[PDB]
Amino acid sequence: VLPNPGLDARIPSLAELETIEQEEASSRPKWDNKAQYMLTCLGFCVGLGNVWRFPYLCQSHGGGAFMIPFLILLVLEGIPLLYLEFAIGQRLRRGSLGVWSSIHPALKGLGLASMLTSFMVGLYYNTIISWIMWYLFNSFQEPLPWSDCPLYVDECARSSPVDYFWYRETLNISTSISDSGSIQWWMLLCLACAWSVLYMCTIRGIETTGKAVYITSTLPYVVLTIFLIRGLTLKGATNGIVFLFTPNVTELAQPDTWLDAGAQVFFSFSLAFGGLISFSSYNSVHNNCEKDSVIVSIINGFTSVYVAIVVYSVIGFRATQRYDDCFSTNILTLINGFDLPEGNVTQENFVDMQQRCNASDPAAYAQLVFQTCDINAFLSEAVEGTGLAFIVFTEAITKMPLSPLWSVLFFIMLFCLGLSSMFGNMEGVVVPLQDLRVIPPKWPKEVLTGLICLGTFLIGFIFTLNSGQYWLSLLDSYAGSIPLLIIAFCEMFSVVYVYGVDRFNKDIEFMIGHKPNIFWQVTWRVVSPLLMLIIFLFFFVVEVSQELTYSIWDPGYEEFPKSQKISYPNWVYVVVVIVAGVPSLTIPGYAIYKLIRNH
């Protein structure tokens, strides 16, 4: 619809696509099976997000009610944009920078942003995998090292050993972002191991990953299943599940609900990164990409809830343990206070016995101190993000027979999830570079892959500093925000108003021997564009409704166990502009440069 001339030349012709696949047998990679493509795309969607982000939002945002919006944006935007990404990659036979540059030269900014976004997300996801494999190496000790207090550190004596193994034994965390220190050697060692394991899998390319993706996408499901049948035998598991699916219909009427539900569909589908487009561009020209986008989204909606069932089974067991232990302490207090026979006082008659004791001896009873015991309170102690893996799941595992085994299986699963996600992000950084021909066409792709691995490894030394966890919680908070949505809005816009949906549906007709149903057309025209905008308007209604305040550990001061929280320094807005404005202003920024280089 927008008048771009010469566009036809930028793209290969439909008559020429029957002959291009018998000559791109050389000089372009190819999938070995269809299973190898579907498993590499499921792996990219599935990750540590749906482990410690999706389950938390599913409960915090109206529980059962939150599912309604999630599914709404999932089918209104997730599937529609996914299809558009698979189809445009299979048609134009290039990666993300290739596709947008052809649709129109000034659209080069889209690829630049997608490449900048993939570099920043993969920079911090490989520090999280660094931490996961530090906990996997420490999983070969009958009394797991987060099981007991170091003889006892007052800091560790307060809170718990688990809270001590993470902030001190593993992080050596500071009390502020203004407090950086020395590279934690063991942390650096684990960072090396993470980038090394990634290079071996992505050194050659989709070919090498093609083998790894299978296990990195299979192992997780097998282990997740083994965990469900174990989780549902641990007492209190149902309490947690019921807790996850209690519907708060009032939370539907909130602008903060639909933004997170919106941002989750976009990160959960790996959209606006570009890796997906590159993966699709290696299929046959006559591959059904309409049936592939429906199968991958169906598995992503089922996996999302299936992992939430496994997470809240452990949250329910861990809270049922806490509650019972506190109740037992309260009972022991009474028995010790009144020398009552053991077994005389029980969880059922504790209240009446408490009254009888107080009646008999009010002074003595007055001296007695009893803790508050509410299963709901323990249930509502669930942490969002790394805390759920390193602080909640690690502590529930220590209270389980065959403890080390369960810990091991739990860390290989998270490792596999993270690593499959990394394949996608690496695809998003390497392919654009070759589009820019950065690597000498002499140096093999492995050289470029290693360069990328070693360059991102050296920048990841910021997260091995004592303040490295405060940097990662900031980057993570501003790595998948508006930029991802912004890129996603312009990919949709560029396919419909610049390249024209007419060519798209026609090209769809050419590949799947049929044109898409009214659904696709309508969503790609109003449903998606309009819905994304209201998510874009919510961001400046919620991000502005918040403040730059981050939690700190601070072994001393205030209450060590209490989550002490402080504001951010004035220079952090420079970092947020860099992690937000930079990947959102190259789309106009390159489009203003190109429109004044010609004129």
Partner: peptide, 30 residues
Amino acid sequence: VSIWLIVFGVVMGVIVVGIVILIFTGIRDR
């Protein structure tokens, strides 16, 4: 001996062997 370190060593060994053979096949393309 900080078992974790021993686990780190063995894991690194497997990865380095894998990347070595991978780059080997990289030059082994005739």
